[PDB]
Amino acid sequence: EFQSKPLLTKREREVFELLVQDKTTKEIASELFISEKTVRNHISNAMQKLGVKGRSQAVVELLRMGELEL
Amino acid sequence: SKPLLTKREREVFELLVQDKTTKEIASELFISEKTVRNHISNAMQKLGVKGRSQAVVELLRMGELEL
């Protein structure tokens, strides 16, 4: 309706939801049927969108924003 | 189940979730960057996880960190 689209794309969110369950990037790639490079690319793009340098800070910010659950 | 962090280990994570690099943490807590990495590693081992983000998520789960 009028709310803006989530900052994360669908696939970025899937990667992050696996990330918080302790999966390695190989396991995420295997689960999502994509290359590891693609997993890294998704993590990288999401952190450039949040303007943070590390995965920890991406997770925290995403959690603050309601874009990721736990 | 419930692993206990020392004062320093908790402090490092508390600073970590405020978007500080290890360099900055080292500066604020008046210790070396090596010592900061050591506290992080030892916390990760107590928590049974593989990286910093997983440590943060497990501490959030247990109620030992707040955002």
Curated annotation (Swiss-Prot), chain A:
Q: Which residues bind DNA?
A: 25-44
Q: One MF term from GO for this chain?
A: DNA binding
Record keywords: DNA-binding, Germination, Transcription, Transcription regulation
The record's section on InterPro entries has:
Sig_transdc_resp-reg_C-effctor, Tscrpt_reg_LuxR_C, WH-like_DNA-bd_sf
Q: Which GO terms describe its biological process?
A: regulation of DNA-templated transcription
- Can you give the residue ranges of the HTH luxR-type domain? 1-66
Claim: Transport is one of the keywords in the record: no
- Transmembrane intervals: none
Disulfide topology = none
State what this protein does: Involved in the regulation of spore formation. Directs the transcription of several genes that encode structural components of the protein coat that encases the mature spore (CotB, CotC, CotG, CotS, CotV, CotW, CotX, CotY and CotZ). Also controls the cgeAB and cgeCDE operons.
What is the official name of this protein in its record? Spore germination protein GerE
According to its UniProt entry, this protein's organism is: Bacillus subtilis (strain 168)
Where is the organism placed in the taxonomic lineage, from the top? Bacteria, Bacillati, Bacillota, Bacilli, Bacillales
